[PDB]
Amino acid sequence: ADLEDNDETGNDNGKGGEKADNAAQVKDALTKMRAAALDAQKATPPKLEDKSPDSPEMKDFRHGFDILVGQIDDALKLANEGKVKEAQAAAEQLKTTGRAGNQKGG
């Protein structure tokens, strides 16, 4: 049976956990982008619906979520082993880079 009829489930914020303390909010942010790459995979097809394991779709996906996962680990250690200012700096250099292919198999 469906549940629904929910309202006291924090509908006044839907979150209330952005922390915004010091470097902590940066880690939750990096982890957010992490699940985005996987969720974007064969789970929540962003705009695929016309490729599937056909052509480099596999590698760009593997090599794609790998880069994101690769910088998420590098950026997270910075937040831990670094302050939020030093950590936010990493986002700046990663902001211009971040993605790279976007096309090909996508």
Helix/strand class: mainly alpha
Largest sheet: none
CATH topology: Four Helix Bundle (Hemerythrin (Met), subunit A)
Total number of domains: 1
| Overall radius of gyration | 17 Å
SSE series? HHH
* End-to-end C-alpha gap: 38 Å
Main CATH class = Mainly Alpha
CATH superfamily: Cytochrome c/b562
Portion of residues within helices: 40-55%
What share of the residues does DSSP label as strand, in percent?
under 5%
Helical region count? 3
Number of strands: 0
Can you walk me through this structure?
The chain is an all-alpha fold and 106 residues long. The protein has one domain (22-106): Four Helix Bundle (Hemerythrin (Met), subunit A) (Up-down Bundle). It is built from 3 helices and no strands. Helix 1 runs antiparallel to helix 2 and helix 2 (57-81) runs antiparallel to helix 3 (84-97). The radius of gyration is 17 Å and the shape is flat. It is classed as electron transport.
Task: Describe the structure in brief.
The chain has 106 residues and is mostly helical.
Describe how the helices and strands are arranged.
Layout: H1 24-40, H2 57-81, H3 84-97
PDB class: electron transport
Keywords: protein engineering, protein structure, Berkeley Structural Genomics Center
Assembly: monomeric
Considering the chains and any ligands shown, give keywords for the structure:
monomer, 106 residues, mainly alpha, Four Helix Bundle (Hemerythrin (Met), subunit A), 3 helices, 53% helix
